[model samples]
Target chain A: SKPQPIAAANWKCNGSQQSLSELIDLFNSTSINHDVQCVVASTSSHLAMTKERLSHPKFVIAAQNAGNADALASLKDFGVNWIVLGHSERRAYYGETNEIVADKVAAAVASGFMVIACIGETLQERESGRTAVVVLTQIAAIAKKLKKADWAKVVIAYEPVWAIGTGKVATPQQAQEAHALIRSWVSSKIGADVAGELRILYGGSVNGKNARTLYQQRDVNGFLVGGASLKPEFVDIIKATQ
Target chain B: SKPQPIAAANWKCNGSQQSLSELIDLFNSTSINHDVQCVVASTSSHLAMTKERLSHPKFVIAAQNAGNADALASLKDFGVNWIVLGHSERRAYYGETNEIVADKVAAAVASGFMVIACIGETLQERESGRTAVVVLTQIAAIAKKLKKADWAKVVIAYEPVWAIGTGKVATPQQAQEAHALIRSWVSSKIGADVAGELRILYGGSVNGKNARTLYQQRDVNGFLVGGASLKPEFVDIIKATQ
Candidate 1:
């Protein structure tokens, strides 16, 4: 109730110029929930075109990965105000660790952009019951690098690696528990006020079918969507908060 | 001397919107080497804006890294005809390897864009007398992926990693030997016709002072410039070939 709900799309090494035009058309015609904020985390190549074409007030552009100086500079150049960091894909595919993601968060915040910092556990880590430890450690890396005041600009996305791109949605209960643990960590690290005010989004296979249930959970404020975001169904996910 | 000499500037994640305007102004006023083609490899964020603003017939646009489906799609949208791949910085910093670079080259060529495929040896590799081995191996990755006819769409840039950004210029002799070796390898792989027609560039710390000598080397066709390309000196490097 405190933080605005976000429906964010991570297009991820996808989208053609024509694809962007289609998405823009959809965004223009879709009547999204006024209370929910819409974000599109596009590949770097699409950011400029996305920002230029998608002019709806309810929609904003975010870079899928923004860490290095060159990457952040380009984001700022394109008038991108938001960045996504530490996605499980980035960790597995590009060998990015928590420290690196934290560095990116600090840089993005210092450069005057809001950051969606992602923290997730692998299937192995989750099955082994290290999910809490892994998620907390990832968040700690970011908290260590950022000042308490900077937390205002930070949103956390918890994406379980097994759930990402695998069509395996986390059960509502599973999603809620992880989110609650993260919120509690934030509360303990900073204060209850900041923790309660912070937005934490559930990512990985967040489809229209499950969006409402996940959103209804107390700590699950929103979603950082994957493949579903590409289609008309993404609009349904945004409206789920209504 | 069949293929046009290219004086390509890899701004390498360095320019901003304002700085781009300045470069455009300078490019407009400056009369560069008419015999040589000029290319500027800009960051993705600046490409659309850059292509719109810079309209000289003699000048063209390139992307620093573009081989993935998203990146290549953006290039085609912007009418970007050239792409730089497998730069030492990309290899060292971003975990790009020769095999990956070769894969990208294949994709770019298949998509009908010209590619500058960069191959180089690190200082350690160079010191151990493995320069030829490294350069040939890097090229072999590409050669394996591309058909002989596709070689026409690719330019080989032999940038010794040791010299990149280190202020250590590769001696004309060092550049020539590597270029000759590459030419010989191409000759062996695809035959003398393609090898002779192919443009091989020498990169790393190429400044106005050394540009002429480097360009004059029998096998060194032109330069894939770095830092010096950002300044007025880049024009002089272009003129070196003339």
Candidate 2:
């Protein structure tokens, strides 16, 4: 059995009330594959309003960042169970280390959230052949803190830092290879059964054009999209799994 | 002619939907001095709901933190004009520095906000007699970026890092001295007229017991309260100026 494909949009530091309304209208009218899951990661200020506007059965709202207990609890209070944590931006800009992310993961999972745990390598790390080592190190830190039952709440996203918001996406082969490596690493840690059920997403400049090919790969579950998530073509990405 | 005293609360990553409703109801029911301005600095999640729930003419809503442009714009869109920036908690826990706070102040004031610019020292700095140096350094960063015209939107809050949330507040004289120093610094940078009109607040475990005495000081304009702001006693603090 295949895992559910997720097309999660990270609308990081964007959207006003008017723009949010337009985005919500587009999301409501678009028809997505029934087997696919769609999550819109919003700015913290917009979460409550987003939940109110987008009540479609297919849509789930997520917070782009929740590195603290209060933020996680507040999102849960508003019925937002999905959270995006540990993006490279948070790591580089906000001093979020793997240890801090692991703590957040533990707290979110304990509070019963569907955590989209992001792990990535910088361009320098990748060029130096440290991509696998870096991502694996990040994963191991969080994996040690979770129980076997908690694996269901976890979804891993691979967003190469250099490619994000830079208009340069990893090639399909590059994405697939990274996804495969992560899947194998998880399998080794938590066993094949739980690992196969976990979703591994490729996220870096993902768009409607490349989404379909990426969705077809063996370990590539779906995408954690950036700027393209705000556009109408995100509907195309959601339909890719079909 | 003294500036209007401000009773601003920084919820600081606290509160839930149910608890917040009670707090809002208490705020709406309480009566305070008309000359005083009351602001509630709530979590970003609660900003919209807070605006909707508390419509009293005397009450203004504020964000506990808004260090980014998108957040500042969203707050402005939601009719929230006051923002609390550069708290010691944000500086120590998060990576907010004096430079970052200066940028935030420039952006917030340019976008038409009444900024509650917080500056403080740690216990270590105070013990070493470097308290004035630390706070002045923090203020200088923002002052360098602003013109004399921008000072109208600024309110200086002195919250010593060690005193915040520790239930150990600075003594009346200690607070008075700090406020006086900040006022003189403003006078030197801007002018006597602007400094006289500028509100300076003492915020470090301020409560009903000490509010009146602190409010009576020569340069103490009001408070940027913490834990006590959530309670019914906040009204007492608001009326302390009267």
Candidate 3:
């Protein structure tokens, strides 16, 4: 967490030219904490305009998904360098397997692109008391694919399927427990120092109202805001990092 | 086909910034047949640049794929009115069933976007002599989703799984046979008059060498050009229609 937490806003299959443009204008006019890293994730259809309008490092453009090798390779052309891979929507809706997700993560890192690799348990997995088992299994698949050096470009996001867009925010205690568990997993697999430097973001129903409380958790490095990302309160969500 | 034929290039996970830019330049500089509705498709990451760099109707920009509803809705803002859905690769590698393909095609049509709805048989299906059965079933799913009015926005591309990118071109006879079968299916399912007006494009290993011959087939309305779309000879491929 020492490097400063990131605040990534995933538009997630939602964006219109006018609406996104309006949001960009609002973002540019607002006072932002330069200490925090920010990303605006949208469908590939909106990334170009999003990038064109927002300043990088301030609002780095990210694609919510990617295709294959050449498709990932072409992202550099339009100034999109960050990608959100293996979102639950993609894993559940699209047929992206853990292996497929890891393969994309590997390709993204190999291409020198920053990746926010998403992993979490489905509702059933969580209810069945297999949250860590399922979540870590997702991470392990991706970890196996990355070489030691490649870990630097990756950030993990833990979004509980039971919580996403259902207004069921994970309690601060629940969030901390999961994030701490993920950090421990990383530490065990790749060494403590490496895990210490890694960023793990919490997603699923993160919003301005509870951002501050969630941000206070030691292992909760940042947030991957979903539906709340498009609202006016998004400014407060990033500003919540303080 | 009563309407002039279309010449669509599906980059299908191929296209870099430099290469696509260079090809856009190559396309703009070349003498193209204006009568032929032309399309240049790349991954969504490149569509904004593709649209920005090309003259529409001349080089109409297209995305090789699309996500869900909102994603499809956003394409119009960037001047991409066309999409390629359910490619053999998506069916085989991406787990896109006929139902999924039809859902996307339905969404695209609902949004008033022109869709290149790709349908095909696998090598196994073909070897088993179930080619027509498989192709029509794929078509039937999509057709079932579309209202009679929606047919105008949908163009079917027959890309046989056996021939895509393997250097195994479906012979002119083979291509026509598929196209004819598809048109006949449309004629049976919908009205013959509606089917008569619909354009069924031939895809899979379509290249400069065979474009002219393929275009000569009465049932072969146009082509969905693949690997050859990026080649310098793409000009000849489009010009072949005359």
Candidate 1, residues B1-242, lDDT tens digits: the string is 64678888776332345656787777778875367788988765567677888876688889877767876886787788799888765664345677788888899998899999999876556767888888888899999988889998999888876664333557899888888999998898888999988999887667788898888888888888764345667778878876
What are the runs in model 2 whose C-alpha is more than 4 Å off? A1-242, B67-70, B165-168
Preferred candidate (lDDT higher): 1 or 3: 1
User: Which residue window of length 10 is worst by lDDT in model 1 chain A?
Assistant: A160-169
The lDDT per prediction is 0.78, 0.78, 0.76
- lDDT (Cα, tens digit) per residue for candidate 1, span A217-237: 999888887643456688888
Mark the regions of model 3 whose C-alpha exceeds 4 Å error after superposition.
A165-167, B1-242
lDDT of 2 at B173: 90
Docking class of 3: incorrect
Off by over 4 Å in 1: A1-242
TM-score of 2: 0.53
Which window of ten consecutive residues has the lowest lDDT sum in model 3 chain B? B160-169
Measured with DockQ on alpha carbons, how good is candidate 1? Answer: 0.04
Each candidate's number of clashing pairs is 0, 0, 0
